[PDB]
């Protein structure tokens, strides 16, 4: 058997950008309030209080090319 | 057999950014209160309190390219 | 059996930025107040309280090219 | 006679407030024209002109207690 | 006569707050203009002209407890 | 006669502030022009002119207690 | 012949303005995009492309008098 | 022959303005697309393509008085 | 012949600004692109690309009087 396997990619991904700004991103800015009294935990406990795992994520090109070139005999 | 695994490949991912700024992030600027009475805990306690793990992340590309060449025989 | 394994890569992954630049990260700013009374643990405690593991990251690039040549004979 | 005076107080009086902010105040910033001629006093003159005694009062809390125990025999 | 005065005070005035900022005052930004002819005063003048006395007040607290006892025999 | 006088205090008066700034005060950055001609004074003159007696205060705290304890026999 | 050119000017040209501000100019914040193929120019060719000769003109007064006296014999 | 030119001008041209803002100019925020192919100019060309020209005039006054005097013998 | 030419200026032109200021201009903040292929030019070319020639003229007073005294004889 003869195989062959010669996929030429010339692709272009490309993003243009003149400018990118003025981004404002506030996770709690309020007021949180947490009581407990009497509580009975048999059992592990995660807890998460606050202003937690916030992103701001402003690439500037920030494109993906995602490319599986998969063979099998 | 004969295999002749020979991809090709000469894609540009490009990325053109005039300016990038005036980025902000405030996370937990507020008031946060935990109030704990009497509990009872038999088993593991994981406690994340206030602002945490919270990310800001400006690149000034942040362009991504994944690429999986895979032969089995 | 001749197997010929010669994927050939001429791709660029690129990033022009002109500027980059009046970036703000300011995690926990705010006020955070832990009260606790007669609490009973039983098993292990992880506590984290205030502002911790926040990250501001802003590369001039910061561009990945992933790439992963498997041959299974 | 026997007078017991014995008020007992235990009151909260209690604020929470997650942020405050973005307070412009602007007194005169417009134009002001004061014109006099000929003009007689035969007595004081007190005379203020522009932009006086304004205030901005901003306080985080700004509670008020007011507590008068007055006994009279 | 036996008077006994005994009042009793546990209070709590509380403020909290996370964050508190962003404050502008401008008083007389403006333009003020005061012409004066021929005029005649006989007893005491006091004259201000401008930006006088203004205040600008931004007390993280600013609470207030006041707080009178009288025994009058 | 006899007079007990034991007012006993256990008060708090708090403020908690996370943070506190960002405050600006611009008294009298206008234009001020007095113009006179051929006034007349018999009596004393107190004259301001321009920006005077302002004031920016700003403390963390600025809370206040006013406690009179007045027996009169 | 006896000319007598007495022309007598006292005039006012006057501006009063108490604030001038917040003034925003963005020309050309758009996407522009010129696209040339096999063009024959036998002459002379000017060529302007993007955001050019874009004027902001705040003047604080900007008053004219224009005065032409003008004697023919 | 006698001729007196004599021309008395008092008069007053006055503006006053408060505040003068608050004002946008957004000239081309949108998008140009200009796609030529195979033309033929025998001749000159002037080309303007994008945001040109574009004026913010904000004068505090911007009064005029236009004077001519003209004595013709 | 007598001619007298005796003209007599005592104007003015005055402006009055209390405040002058937030003056944005950002000409070309976007994004432009000028493609040419195989063109022909047979005589000059003068060409512009970008953002060139963009003016802010902020004076605080920016009068002008403009006066001209021609005597013909």
Avoid at 2 to 29: E, R
Wanted: aromatic share 4%; with cysteine; proline share 4%.
């Amino acid at each position: 058997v003869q195989i062959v396997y010669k996929p030429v990619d010339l692709s272009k991904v490309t993003s243009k950008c003149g400018s990118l700004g003025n981004i404002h991103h506030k996770p709690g800015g309020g007021q949180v309030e947490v009581k407990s009294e009497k509580l009975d935990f048999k059992d592990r406990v995660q807890s998460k209080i606050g202003s937690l795992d916030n992103i701001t994520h402003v690439p500037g090109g920030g494109n993906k090319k995602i490319e599986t070139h998969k063979l099998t005999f």
